[PDB]
Amino acid sequence: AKEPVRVLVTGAAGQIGYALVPMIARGIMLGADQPVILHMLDIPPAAEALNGVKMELIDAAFPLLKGVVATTDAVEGCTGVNVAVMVGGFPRKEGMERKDVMSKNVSIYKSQAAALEKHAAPNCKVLVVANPANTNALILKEFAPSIPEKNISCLTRLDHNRALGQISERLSVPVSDVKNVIIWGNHSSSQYPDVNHAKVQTSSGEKPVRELVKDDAWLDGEFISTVQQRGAAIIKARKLSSALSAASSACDHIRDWVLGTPEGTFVSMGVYSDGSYSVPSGLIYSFPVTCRNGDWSIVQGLPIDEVSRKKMDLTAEELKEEKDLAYSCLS
Amino acid sequence: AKEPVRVLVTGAAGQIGYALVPMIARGIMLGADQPVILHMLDIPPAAEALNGVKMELIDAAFPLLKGVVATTDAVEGCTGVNVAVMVGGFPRKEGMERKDVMSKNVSIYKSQAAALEKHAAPNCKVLVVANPANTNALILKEFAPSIPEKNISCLTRLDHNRALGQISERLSVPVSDVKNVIIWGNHSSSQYPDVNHAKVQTSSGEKPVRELVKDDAWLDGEFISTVQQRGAAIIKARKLSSALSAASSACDHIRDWVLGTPEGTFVSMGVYSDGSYSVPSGLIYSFPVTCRNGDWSIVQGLPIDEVSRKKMDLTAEELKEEKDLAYSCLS
Numbered sequence: 001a002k003e004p005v006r007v008l009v010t011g012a013a014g015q016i017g018y019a020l021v022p023m024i025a026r027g028i029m030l031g032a033d034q035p036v037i038l039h040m041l042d043i044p045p046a047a048e049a050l051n052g053v054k055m056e057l058i059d060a061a062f063p064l065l066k067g068v069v070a071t072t073d074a075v076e077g078c079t080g081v082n083v084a085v086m087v088g089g090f091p092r093k094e095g096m097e098r099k100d101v102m103s104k105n106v107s108i109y110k111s112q113a114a115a116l117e118k119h120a121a122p123n124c125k126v127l128v129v130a131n132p133a134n135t136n137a138l139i140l141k142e143f144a145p146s147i148p149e150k151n152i153s154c155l156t157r158l159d160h161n162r163a164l165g166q167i168s169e170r171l172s173v174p175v176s177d178v179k180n181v182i183i184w185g186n187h188s189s190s191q192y193p194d195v196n197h198a199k200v201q202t203s204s205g206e207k208p209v210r211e212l213v214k215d216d217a218w219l220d221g222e223f224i225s226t227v228q229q230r231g232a233a234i235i236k237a238r239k240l241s242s243a244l245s246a247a248s249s250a251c252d253h254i255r256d257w258v259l260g261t262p263e264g265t266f267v268s269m270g271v272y273s274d275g276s277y278s279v280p281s282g283l284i285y286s287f288p289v290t291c292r293n294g295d296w297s298i299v300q301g302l303p304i305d306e307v308s309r310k311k312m313d314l315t316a317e318e319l320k321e322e323k324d325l326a327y328s329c330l331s
Numbered sequence: 332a333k334e335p336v337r338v339l340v341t342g343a344a345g346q347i348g349y350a351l352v353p354m355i356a357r358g359i360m361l362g363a364d365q366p367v368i369l370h371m372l373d374i375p376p377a378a379e380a381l382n383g384v385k386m387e388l389i390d391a392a393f394p395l396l397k398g399v400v401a402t403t404d405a406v407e408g409c410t411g412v413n414v415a416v417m418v419g420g421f422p423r424k425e426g427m428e429r430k431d432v433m434s435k436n437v438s439i440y441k442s443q444a445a446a447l448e449k450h451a452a453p454n455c456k457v458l459v460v461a462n463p464a465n466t467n468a469l470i471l472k473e474f475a476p477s478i479p480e481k482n483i484s485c486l487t488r489l490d491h492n493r494a495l496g497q498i499s500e501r502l503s504v505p506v507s508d509v510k511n512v513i514i515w516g517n518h519s520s521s522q523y524p525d526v527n528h529a530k531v532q533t534s535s536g537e538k539p540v541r542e543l544v545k546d547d548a549w550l551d552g553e554f555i556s557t558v559q560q561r562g563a564a565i566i567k568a569r570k571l572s573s574a575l576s577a578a579s580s581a582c583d584h585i586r587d588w589v590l591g592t593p594e595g596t597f598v599s600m601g602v603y604s605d606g607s608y609s610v611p612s613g614l615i616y617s618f619p620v621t622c623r624n625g626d627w628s629i630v631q632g633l634p635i636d637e638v639s640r641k642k643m644d645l646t647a648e649e650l651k652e653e654k655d656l657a658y659s660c661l662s
């Protein structure tokens with residue numbers, strides 16, 4: 001706890017960035033006893049707003065915060081960083097086509113991969129939040145071949161937490177009593193929110209979610225659609241995509257990765273596939289994982305039924321489609 | 332830690348509200364072992380946005396969070412609450428006159444005083460953030476005569492933290508090493524940011540701020556102007572008033588009040604004056620305080636020089652002027 005961790009947030013002058021940086025400064029990401037230095041990266045049109053954010057961080061008198069670099073220079077932003085949370089991008093607005101959203105975002109990741117690879121600290125842990133999350137991360141990984149493949153991840157923790165919240169609300173139990181949902185595959189409407197291995201603490205012990213809900217039709221239909229469409233639902237309610245919950249879930253992702261998952265719990269992370277669960281290797285794909293010693297490990301040995309298999313493959317195929325589109329934009 | 336605390340945030344669909352609610356849900360306001368129930372109050376035009384916020388809070392799967400009421404009904408919002416953070420209001424926009432800002436905001440506090448007085452839990456701790464903070468709080472107190480006078484406060488903790496940050500930056504030391512600035516009086520450009528009693532931890536012990544800075548002209552001039560004008564500086568940088576830092580400082584205010592100040596530290600709180608330091612009684616006025624057992628206590632026995640006296644009286648006079656304007660709007 002004497003030495004500080006350097007944490008980069010790209011897209012720092014945006015909505016998620018604004019929600020996220022004070023959570024990091026308060027110790028929510030790396031623990032209450034871990035000092036942090038923030039590096040905040042955005043682009044020249046947001047230079048004033050970015051300086052504004054730094055002014056606020058200073059103004060909060062955060063005792064764990066030992067420095068703030070606020071910049072539009074990617075080299076400076078990436079120098080010496082130990083954690084990189086990549087939020088820089090352009091959210092889809094009405095009128096944009098899927099190709100334009102892809103093209104505007106993957107170019108960022110191609111470019112910033114070189115800056116991270118050359119300047120970040122060696123065992124830097126990387127989390128891509130910007131959409132399309134898995135594909136942006138895959139592009140980053142491909143353009144930064146010197147970064148250990150296990151050190152690149154994308155955020156499906158918001159999907160995971162959304163799923164936990166849906167179960168909590170459906171049963172009217174506290175969310176702290178629900179665990180071990182799984183989000184398989186892409187951060188998109190093709191994801192598989194899987195409750196086959198999930199549990200709820202009750203007065204008579206841990207029970208499986210399906211036994212308490214007693215409505216397989218709901219779990220297999222509307223529950224899944226609800227999680228798949230939840231980001232669009234936030235936009236409908238707020239006229240803006242999620243931020244408070246994306247930031248909080250990015251803290252959870254990093255925190256669990258670095259400090260470890262609790263005994264008996266697994267969480268979802270988009271990680272570089274190795275062939276586990278017969279998912280094609282070389283995709284950024286969400287798996288159930290446990291974390292220990294700063295490393296993720298896919299939870300092996302879960303039974304997979306026919307319906308689960310088919311959903312897992314469908315989302316893998318979407319990820320291949322996205323990869324092809326990204327490639328198309330970059331050539 | 333078994334029983335939850337009910338925390339009301341009014342103005343919950345706004346900028347500060349959005350920054351604040353997830354900090355409460357994470358345990359930053361009342362501690363990592365204290366479950367919370369959120370009540371979020373806003374007005375009918377923000378009903379959709381407010382529901383959006385609740386959706387995000389659910390989606391974050393906060394383990395300390397045991398319920399969220401999101402409403403436009405003040406009676407419902409105030410029912411059973413133990414902490415009330417009042418952020419509901421209208422920030423000054425270019426084109427508004429001082430009378431209009433006052434009139435639009437103090438009417439809220441007149442109205443909501445009755446709802447809190449009738450429905451909040453008996454020892455409910457109240458913090459007014461909305462501007463004009465001290466005067467809104469004074470109006471609330473006057474319209475809720477059954478609330479113990481020591482239970483009504485306003486936020487000068489952001490001013491206090493700003494002052495700490497300025498010292499930290501000027502000396503290039505970590506803010507964790509700086510303490511015991513004092514903000515006297517109004518949350519406004521008439522405040523007195525006082526460093527006469529402040530300290531910095533160094534390698535050769537706690538030293539007074541003036542001894543390390545060695546520039547009394549700066550401390551007595553530009554330092555004070557900088558703190559007095561800092562909110563306007565945020566607006567110039569961001570095109571919006573402070574939020575991340577206001578939320579964080581509201582957490583600090585409540586946390587210190589409820590859990591106690593550290594030994595050797597005092598903090599600033601706008602509280603109901605009792606005649607201490609020859610400040611007129613019956614104003615909401617920022618003082619240096621320590622907190623223990625859920626109660627503030629003004630730090631008595633600080634030496635006050637001639638210049639300090641005059642500044643303390645000038646800000647008291649502004650508060651009287653504001654009070655007269657508020658009265659004028661309410662009759």
Ligand SMILES: NC(=O)c1ccc[n+]([C@@H]2O[C@H](COP(=O)([O-])OP(=O)(O)OC[C@H]3O[C@@H](n4cnc5c(N)ncnc54)[C@H](O)[C@@H]3O)[C@@H](O)[C@H]2O)c1
Nearest residue numbers: 011013014015016042088089091129130131133155158246
């Ligand atoms: N669970 C998830 O993975 C999840 C949830 C919500 C949003 N998102 C995505 O996160 C991203 C950010 O959302 P937001 O609401 O914060 O958007 P926003 O537009 O408010 O913020 C994005 C910021 O990125 C900046 N940016 C653009 N190009 C950049 C570059 N080259 N380097 C650094 N910064 C750059 C922009 O200036 C802007 O300040 C979006 O892509 C969004 O779709 C993902």
Ligand SMILES: NC(=O)c1ccc[n+]([C@@H]2O[C@H](COP(=O)([O-])OP(=O)(O)OC[C@H]3O[C@@H](n4cnc5c(N)ncnc54)[C@H](O)[C@@H]3O)[C@@H](O)[C@H]2O)c1
Nearest residue numbers: 342344345346347373419420422460461462464486489577
């Ligand atoms: N240190 C401080 O004390 C400090 C710092 C910054 C801002 N402020 C003040 O805090 C307030 C909020 O700032 P913001 O940026 O969040 O503004 P904002 O406009 O984004 O949010 C205010 C919210 O209050 C709501 N509101 C209006 N009337 C209401 C009522 N009767 N009941 C409940 N809600 C109501 C509005 O709909 C809006 O959602 C402003 O008055 C601002 O000047 C104080």
Ligand code: NA
Nearest residue numbers: 216217218220
């Ligand atoms: Na079914």
Ligand code: NA
Nearest residue numbers: 274276297298
């Ligand atoms: Na493996």
Ligand code: NA
Nearest residue numbers: 547548549551
């Ligand atoms: Na002087």
Ligand code: NA
Nearest residue numbers: 605607628629
């Ligand atoms: Na007293």
